[PDB]
Amino acid sequence: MSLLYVLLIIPIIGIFLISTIDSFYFFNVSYYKKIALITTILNLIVSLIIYILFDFSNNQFQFIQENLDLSFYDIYLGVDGVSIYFVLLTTIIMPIALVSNWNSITNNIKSYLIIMLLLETLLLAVFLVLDVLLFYIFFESILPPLFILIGLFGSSNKVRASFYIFLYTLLGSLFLLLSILTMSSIVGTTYFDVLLKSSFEYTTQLFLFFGIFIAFAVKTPVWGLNSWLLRAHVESPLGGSIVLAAIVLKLSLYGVFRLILPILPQASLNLTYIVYAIGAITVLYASFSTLRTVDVKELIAYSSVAHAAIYLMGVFSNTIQGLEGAILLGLAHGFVSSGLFICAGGILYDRTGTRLIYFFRGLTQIMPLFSLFFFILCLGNAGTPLTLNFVGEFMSLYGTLERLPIAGMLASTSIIFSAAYSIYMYNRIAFGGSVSLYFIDCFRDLTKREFFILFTLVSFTVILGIYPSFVLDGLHYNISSVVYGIEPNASYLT
Amino acid sequence: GLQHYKIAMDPALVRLGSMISNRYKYFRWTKRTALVSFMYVVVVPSTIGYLAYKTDGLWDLRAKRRGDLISER
Amino acid sequence: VVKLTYPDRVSYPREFEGGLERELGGAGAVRAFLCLDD
Amino acid sequence: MYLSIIILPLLGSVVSGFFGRKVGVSGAQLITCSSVIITTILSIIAFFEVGFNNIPVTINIFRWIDSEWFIINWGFQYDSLTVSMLIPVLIISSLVHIYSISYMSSDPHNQRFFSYLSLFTFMMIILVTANNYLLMFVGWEGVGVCSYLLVSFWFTRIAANQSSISAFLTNRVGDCFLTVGMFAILWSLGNLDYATVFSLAPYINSNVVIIIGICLLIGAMAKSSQVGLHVWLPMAMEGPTPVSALIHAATMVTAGVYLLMRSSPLIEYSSTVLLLCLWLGAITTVFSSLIGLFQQDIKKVIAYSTMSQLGMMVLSIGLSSYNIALFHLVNHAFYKALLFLGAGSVIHAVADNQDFRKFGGLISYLPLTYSVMLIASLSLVAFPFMTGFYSKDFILESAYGQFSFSGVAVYIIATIGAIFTTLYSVKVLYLTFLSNPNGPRTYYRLAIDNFFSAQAIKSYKPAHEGDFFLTLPLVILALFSIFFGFITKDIFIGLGSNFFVDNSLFIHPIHEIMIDTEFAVPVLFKLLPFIFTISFSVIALTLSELLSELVIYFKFSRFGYNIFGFFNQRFLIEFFYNKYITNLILNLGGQITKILDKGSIELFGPYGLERGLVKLSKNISSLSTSHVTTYALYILVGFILYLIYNNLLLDYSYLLLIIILLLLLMMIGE
Amino acid sequence: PKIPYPKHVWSPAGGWYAQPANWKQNTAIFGLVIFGITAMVWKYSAEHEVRHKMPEPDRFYPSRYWVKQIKDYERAQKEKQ
Amino acid sequence: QYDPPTGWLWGVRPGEKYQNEGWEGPFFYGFWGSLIVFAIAYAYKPDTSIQTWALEEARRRLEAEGILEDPN
Amino acid sequence: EGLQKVEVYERIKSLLAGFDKVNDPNNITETAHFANDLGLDSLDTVEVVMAIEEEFSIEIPDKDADQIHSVDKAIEYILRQPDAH
Amino acid sequence: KPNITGFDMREFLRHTKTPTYDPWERHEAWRYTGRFSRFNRFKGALPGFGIATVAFTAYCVFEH
Amino acid sequence: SNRQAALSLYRRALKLALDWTVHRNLWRGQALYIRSLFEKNRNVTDPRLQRALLKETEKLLEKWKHPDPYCPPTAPGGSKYERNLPVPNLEPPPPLKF
Ligand SMILES: *P(=O)(O)OCC(C)(C)[C@H](O)C(=O)NCCC(=O)NCCSC(=O)CCCCCCCCCCCCC
Ligand SMILES: CCCCCCCCCCCCO[C@@H]1O[C@H](CO)[C@@H](O[C@H]2O[C@H](CO)[C@@H](O)[C@H](O)[C@H]2O)[C@H](O)[C@H]1O
Ligand SMILES: CCCCCCCCCCCCO[C@@H]1O[C@H](CO)[C@@H](O[C@H]2O[C@H](CO)[C@@H](O)[C@H](O)[C@H]2O)[C@H](O)[C@H]1O
Ligand SMILES: CCCCCCCCCCCCO[C@@H]1O[C@H](CO)[C@@H](O[C@H]2O[C@H](CO)[C@@H](O)[C@H](O)[C@H]2O)[C@H](O)[C@H]1O
Ligand SMILES: CCCCCCCCCCCCO[C@@H]1O[C@H](CO)[C@@H](O[C@H]2O[C@H](CO)[C@@H](O)[C@H](O)[C@H]2O)[C@H](O)[C@H]1O
């Protein structure tokens, strides 16, 4: 078998072992939790093996398997530079997502581990599939496990939060399905190699655009359609929050490099001013209302909306720099949003049972290790240099300015507004006076568990900020394939 | 779930946080809420979108030197 | 009040041999004063 | 060696911050101070290396950002302008470190403080040694993060947390415009390296240079605290005094000036920005000279004095004499640091009181401090033959030396701004040392007079001078404040000096005004600032000492009541910023959250579809009464509607109207 | 007078008045590792600094003694007649 | 009069020791161990980037011009 | 370490001694009363507490200033303040 | 026209002087005497001037 | 009521005098004048006029208020206020595991 199918079977094998260990011993929950964690590490070791062998300048899909047997629906796995880093991000997060929530679950622990081990397979598949209906199949197979993750292990407003995520994601994704079905009808298959050769008529493209963008606008999400995230992320367990922000919010970002940039170019060009108008508005409104949010975990969720808008305008720039910056800002968001969710949902909520910023003040005085990491993750949310978040924003913002200058000029105001809320949240929890008086007893500082996942996430954010060429050298040639345009003296060569 | 440390939960702040959470259940359509909603959701995006269309492809700065014009169109 | 009563320049602009046009970037670059109007 | 100047302050910061427990207060102080002393010595050598020999030094380590047409390296260039900046940056950083051992001795957290000091020095080195605009931006942001960390050092105090928000966010506004300006450079030339941008500058579209120059200038207001974005600099006086001596009055404030001086080979090709630089400079000098004369805090006055000198350098930049602005920049960081370290010394002696209204006498109690601050105040007013004489007085005669309306205008404006500088210099030196004691006897009760019987062993505390780690910096900076201007006047002023002939400071032959400033300017205007300083100083001394009633008459008149409160409240710029910009943004956030996100977006969305559909579904579900007689009638009804539709050839749209009518009829109750 | 503080709080920077009794030994050890680290970056500088103009033979320029580009130049220039 | 250094790292009081919760084994040996082994392997990964390929051709075109000197 | 009773008393004794509205410098003790022992008006005592406020560089709120009607009550208040010089 | 309070600002400024009699006169007399007399405050306002003036005259007499 | 109120206004009007007149000698003459104006009204009894003279004083304290009144350094509004505020809870954390 191939090496991309080993990525999928290992999390499935872990599901089987958790389900059968009680049949060999009444077994401890600690034994269930070591199985799930060792299983996620092995997937991460395979994924690092794949990256060692990967060819950074190859236009053919790699690590494929000769099917040679065709059915109505068949799984085709391959890897290109555009997808390798999304796979790696999924395989670094899932181990931390389990470790972060190691003590906080308490009840239904096997069910919790099985859903995450199942989510890892489904989110890994969505990057590995070489068809657009298979992309849709896994881009939407994650909705039943996430409905039950929030309902079983979520917070107080969990029932409504889980109904919002499922119904919005189901509704938005059913307009994508209509567009995909139309392309398959006109071409006869959704396999990428055959679909990317095909050129659609402008009118077909302009209606295929209306339907892929409606799906992506709901799943980005844009400002007037972001209600599900404000509920889903907050009421979700800590581990579910880490997956939904770092990995699920990136499915729409990676879906533009497949469903829009290569097959609907004329539509993307003539409609970019609509995208940029929306993206600009969701940069401003999201940021203004992130300043006045009183739930800390919902202040981290709102921050994600503003960042997704910068990377959405980057994917619509028709520029090499804004396209690579969009992937860098999505990788950067994956580490930093994970840390800020760990701080809000996994350290404060663990010690106080509250998420209201009214109750927190002067936390640096009694918890100096938490405040150090919390400061670094707030600076990265603010796009400070020396973090990968700055590189992605700069390249995403430059391609936005080069495409349509005015919108990138409004979008550049994210430098003042992301800074505003990030420091304001920081000064109100870590600083802002002496330790609050609402704390009856003293709180312990970071545990060796809390410290080492925060340190690991910060380490990826800073090291990749210094030397982004670790990710940039892989995307160059493959990004080169999604640009639409010619130059008058460089084209049509004889 | 896990026992948390003791917090002097202020009844006033707890009911305020409850108020913010259930607030939508009481939104009405008034002359005022429509005016704010129409401004934010229609007018500002339509103004930003209109300028986006009018200035689209209007300027390019690459390699433009003296004697050349920034304006493409 | 300054715009009403402020001095005129007291010395003629300083004149360069050839306008230094080579040393300032060639014909395609701005140069210094060279036997022009004032 | 060159890359070791960069590395040493960084290592001392890491030991003091992440390993303070192992080294302790003493070990942190020793490693932090010694590393920056060593770096200072290596930098004095590099001045002889690079500048006196005209040998620029280039070192590239690895690439930072690699894309199409974008190649930005972790690379460093040492030229004449780089080593010129490094000397005040590293001399003042070294001395403030040594100073801070005495000033912050009683504070609990010394390792964290000294770590932030070394972190600031590292970032300031990165800002002046970079090859490109994007690595210079790392130092720019880094210095901002370090100023936030040092303004908010005492996090328990809320005032400090407000003032650090001001410093952080008012500098992010400048950062937005530099980011736009660097985008313009990449968009026009393809790379933002200095050699690239300056080699190609003479040929770029003249309007493209306008866009870059304006963006570079707007970013320069925030850091150089020019009038448009200056509100943060006086609030940064919340942090401890040694922070205000290095970061807020001798190094970070100058970065905006360095940005324009470095970008001289580019902004020289746009005279439009040069007028804006010039008028920007003249406004800030009178804007801040007037404010400082009506302040009651000593630190607030010395913070508003710094912004009056930063306005002087920006005036010189727009005057197109960059060597003059660089000369003022280096000379100012010696005597502005002196006045702050001297003010910090009197705050230490008088029980942390910072108000002039409670200081008096003290001249006999703090003799060294008074003389040293007299050293600093004479160069601040540019008394003849002081260090500040050769820098500030050449900016004035160069403004009149450019025989233009704008130049004569700024000469008049700046001369008036100099008058108010002399006024608040007397205020500081008179009310703190020369006036009758205005504070409690505790600062002035000695043991030579017996006020006690059974407690003679302790409890006098009579405003004494500090120890060796405090006085030593003050003596050294005094010697600089007397002689450094003379000893370096040729390196910077010169007449045809070739110190910056590696294109570090490019003046275009069209903008040269040096020869007219030497010969054309009349002796009256050349000498005019001197008479004003000597005349006002004596006038303000009499009105403060001999005739003290007259100022009471002015402030007790309704005219002077408004004029005193207008300048004390800093032109009400803080007032209009909170009320119409800061609070406006917080209302806008609330309206979006309350009326849109939690309002109409849920009403014209999931919540309105929920409550609408549940109402509809209850009505249709109430048609089902389990009566066979009524169900039979329904089948006939649904039969006839099918017969009418497929026999009357009705337009299909007529059907859809029926369904929408029917559905909305079940939407209405009763 | 020193502030009362909680003694269970662990900080990497020491906390409120932290000086160990081994402070001198630890400070000595950190000094050597600083000296060793700064010795590697120096040898990097010597082999990677780039100059487009060499110094004069009799003119004070202490870089002459450790940078390879200059040392290659001055040794080559020390071969004539 | 500096105070003794204090505090409980990981919240472990001066009496007892850190108790291994369970995650520590795999996370230190497997998660981090894989990254060091990935880091050492990445050094010997051959460079298949487009630029190392494009620089060498670009030099051979500019060497055919006075812009870049050729070793031949 | 902090303020002592003898130190605060010597300073307030010299404060009231230099005030011409006290009936006699002799009968100013630690337990002296402003109204009758020292014979001070309702406004002279307000001036007195202002002088005490100046001496120790502290602030006396209106709630606390009304309580200060004797020397001993003043001595206690200054020692109840960890902010006096 | 006059306010109910006896406050007049013209009369207020008239009393902005050193009063002839003051109940607090002796409590404040230390701030204008001794180290704080007019001469003592400005005795050393120019620290090095006296030493420098005579020293500079010694250098100034170089004709002989 | 109506007494500590008039004594608060007496202390307040003496602080506003020292705030505008920085020199203590000069404020001393001003201080004797404001006393004379309180001592001129020590026989007002009826509350109709008693409270009018407090209401009109409060106007003159606002009319002549200082833009930056003096605050002692450790006082609220002062420079060293809340500078190294101690933790309000020095007891070790209760023994809970997270
Ligand atoms: P003792 O108990 O004997 O007396 C205390 C008082 C006076 C409170 C008595 O109890 C009493 O008689 N109460 C009645 C109070 C009353 O109605 N009148 C007393 C005077 S109140 C007042 O304000 C008088 C006028 C003062 C005007 C000057 C003050 C304001 C000046 C402006 C500000 C300062 C200059 C810038
Ligand atoms: C398409 C459908 C949606 C798919 C979404 C993914 C759902 C995944 C669910 C995981 C499988 C069910 O998980 C199952 O939970 C039940 C809880 O009653 C456990 O069952 C046991 O739980 C605990 C274990 O101590 C016992 O107290 C309880 O008495 C017993 O029933 C099973 O051992 C576990 O395997
Ligand atoms: C960095 C982000 C922003 C970059 C994108 C914005 C660039 C803005 C460029 C503005 C100038 C564009 O190009 C400019 O257009 C104006 C008209 O508007 C024209 O301006 C022209 O006006 C008159 C006629 O009225 C002409 O006689 C004159 O020669 C010229 O000044 C020129 O064509 C050019 O000077
Ligand atoms: C673009 C427009 C929108 C796209 C589609 C999105 C539609 C989302 C609609 C979801 C509506 C909410 O769905 C409904 O929420 C209520 C909560 O109020 C839930 O009700 C539940 O929560 C309440 C909260 O008090 C509890 O008493 C109890 O757990 C249960 O009754 C319902 O079980 C759920 O069906
Ligand atoms: C950025 C915006 C994106 C929007 C995307 C599409 C969102 C869904 C569109 C339709 C939403 C439903 O819209 C909603 O429908 C129901 C109809 O019963 C109404 O709901 C309400 O009607 C009236 C208020 O007018 C109430 O008295 C009644 O109790 C309630 O049913 C609301 O008047 C309407 O706001």
Four-CA torsion D127, D132, D133, D134, nearest 10 degrees? -90
Q: Which helix (H) or strand (E) holds D339?
A: helix D322-349
Atom 12 of ligand 4, residue of closest alpha carbon: A160
C-alpha–C-alpha distance, residues I78 and I70, integer Å: 9
Task: Kindly list the residues from chain D whose CB atom is less than 8 angstroms away from the CB atom of residue C14.
Answer: 509, 512, 515
Element (H, E) at D74: strand D71-78
Fill in the DSSP letter of residue F27: I
Cβ-proximal residues to D322 (8 Å cutoff; 6+ apart), any chain:
D261, D264, D316, D500, D505, D506, D507
Residue in the structure block whose two tokens are 């054309």: D520
For chain I, the domains span 1-98
Question: Which secondary-structure segment (H or E) carries H10?
Answer: helix H9-14
CA atoms of B59 and A50, how far apart (whole Å): 44
Chain A nearest CA to I12, separation (Å): 30
Phi, psi of D444 (to 5 degrees): -120, 10
Tokens of D252: 């970070």
Strand partners, E18: F3
Token pair for residue E38? 């700064």
The span from the CA of D162 to the CA of D182, in Å, is 30
Q: With an 8 Å Cβ cutoff, is E8 touching chain A?
A: yes
Cβ-based neighbours of D46, under 8 Å, separated by 6 or more: D1, D2, D5, D57, D78, D83, D86
Note whether F6 contacts E8, CB cutoff 8 Å.
yes
Give the residue carrying structure tokens 């004029």: D563
Per DSSP, C7 falls in state P
Q: Which string of DSSP letters, residue by residue, matches I8-48?
A: HHHHHHHHHHHHH--SHHHHHHHHHHHHHHHHTTTT---HH
Distance CA F68, CA A197 (A): 40
What gap in Å lies between CA A123 and CA A130, rounded to an integer? Answer: 14
The pair phi, psi for residue B58, each rounded to 5°, is -70, -40
Measured between alpha carbons, how far is G30 from G53 in angstroms, rounded to an integer? 18
C-alpha pair distances (Å), C17 with each of A240, C28, D207, H39: 76, 18, 29, 66
- Contact indicator for D530, C32 with CB cutoff of 8 Å: no
Amino acid (1-letter code) at residue A280: A
Q: Secondary structure of G3-41 in the HEC alphabet?
A: CCHHHHHHHHHHHHHCCCCCCCCCCCCCCCECCCCCCCC
The chain C residues in contact with chain D (CB within 8 A) are 2-3, 6-11, 14, 16, 20, 24-25, 28-30, 32-33
Residue D203, SS3 per DSSP: helix
What DSSP character marks residue D65?
E
- In D123-258, at which residue ranges do the beta strands (DSSP E only) sit? none
Name the DSSP class of C16: -
What's chain G's length in residues? Answer: 85
Centre a 10 Å sphere on the Cβ of residue I21 and count the other Cβ atoms it contains: 24
The answer to whether the Cβ–Cβ distance between B70 and D187 falls below 8 Å is no
* One-letter amino acid of D385: F
D371 inside 8 A of chain H by CB: yes
**Chain I residues with beta carbon closer than 8 angstroms to that of G47:** 14
β-bridge mates for residue B59, sequence order: B71
Q: What's the token pair of residue G38?
A: 């020292």
- The SS3 assignment for D512 reads coil
Q: Is the dihedral of CA D432, D438, D442, D446 positive or negative?
A: positive
G20 part of the active site: no
- Cβ atoms of E44 and D50 within 8 Å: the answer is no
Q: Which residues contact D226 (CB under 8 A, 6 or more apart)?
A: D220, D256, D280, D281, D283, D284, D307, D310, D311, D314
Per the CB < 8 A criterion, the answer to whether D374 and D339 are in contact is: no
Please name which of D290, D327, D326 lies closest in space to residue D307, comparing C-alpha atoms: D290
> How far is Cα D636 from Cα H6, in angstroms, rounded to an integer?
99
**Of I89, G44, D278, residue with least CA distance to A437:** I89
Comparing CB atoms, the residue among D439, D441, D455 nearest residue G7 is: D455
F window 31-60, beta carbon within 8 A of D: 51
Answer for the pair A29, A114: CB distance below 8 angstroms, yes or no: no
Tokens matching residue G21:
């509205």
> CB count, 10 Å around CB of D508?
17
DSSP secondary structure code for residue D76 in this structure: E
Could you tell me if D260 and D220 are in contact, meaning their C-beta atoms sit under 8 angstroms apart? yes
Structure's resolution in angstroms: 2.8
Atom of ligand 2 nearest to the CA of A144: 3
Are residues I33 and H3, on separate chains, in Cβ contact within 8 Å? Answer: no
* Strand D71-78 versus strand D57-66 pairing type: antiparallel
Using N-to-C axis directions, what is the helix angle for A448-466 and A388-403, rounded to 10°? 40
Contact predicate D153/D116, CB 8 Å = yes
Angstrom distance (rounded) from CA D349 to CA D462? 8
Rounded distance, CA D622 to CA D615, Å? 11
Q: Among D187, D211, D272, name the best residue to mutate to test ligand 3's pocket (greatest count of ligand atoms within 8 A of Cβ).
A: D211
Q: Contacts of residue D592 in chain B, CB cutoff 8 Å?
A: 40
Q: Which tokens hold the place of A129? A: 């599939």
How distant, in Å, are the alpha carbons of D214, D331, D334 from that of D251? 23, 12, 11
CA distance D197 to D191: 8
| DSSP line for H34-52 | GGGSHHHHHHTSSTTHHHH
The amino acid present at F44, given as its one-letter code, is: Y
**Phi, psi for E51 (deg, rounded to 5):** -125, 145
State how far the alpha carbon of D507 is from the alpha carbons of A96, A384, C38, D503, in Å.
Answer: 57, 34, 22, 9
Residue A61: what residue type?
A: F
Tokens matching residue A439: 């704390």
Mapping DSSP onto H, E and C, the string for chain A reads CCHHHHHHHHHHHHHHHHHHHHHHCCCCHHHHHHHHHHHHHHHHHHHHHHHHHCCCCCCCCECCCCCCCCCCCCCCECECHHHHHHHHHHHHHHHHHHHHCCCCCCCCHHHHHHHHHHHHHHHHHHHHECEHHHHHHHHCCCHHHHHHHHHHHCCCCHHHHHHHHHHHHHHHHHHHHHHHHHHHHHHCCCEHHHHHHCCCCHHHHHHHHHHHHHHHHHHCCCHHHCHHHHHHHHHCCHHHHHHHHHHHCCHHHHHHHHHCCCCCHHHHHHCHHHHHHHHHHHHHHHHHHHCCCCEHHHHHHHHHHHHHHHHHHHHCCCCHHHHHHHHHHHHHHHHHHHHHHHHHHHHHHHHHCCCEHHHCCCCCCCCHHHHHHHHHHHHHHCCCCCCHHHHHHHHHHHHHHHHCHHHHHHHCCHHHHHHHHHHHHHHHHCCCCCCCCCECCCCCCCCHHHHHHHHHHHHHHHHHHHCCHHHHHHHHHHHHHHCCCCCCCCCCCC
Q: What is the C-alpha to C-alpha distance for residues A480 and A470, in angstroms, rounded to an integer?
A: 18
Question: Hey, of E7, E24, E25, E27, which one would you mutate to test binding to chain F, going by the most F CBs within 10 A of its CB?
Answer: E7
**How far apart are alpha carbons D14 and A299 in whole angstroms?**
31
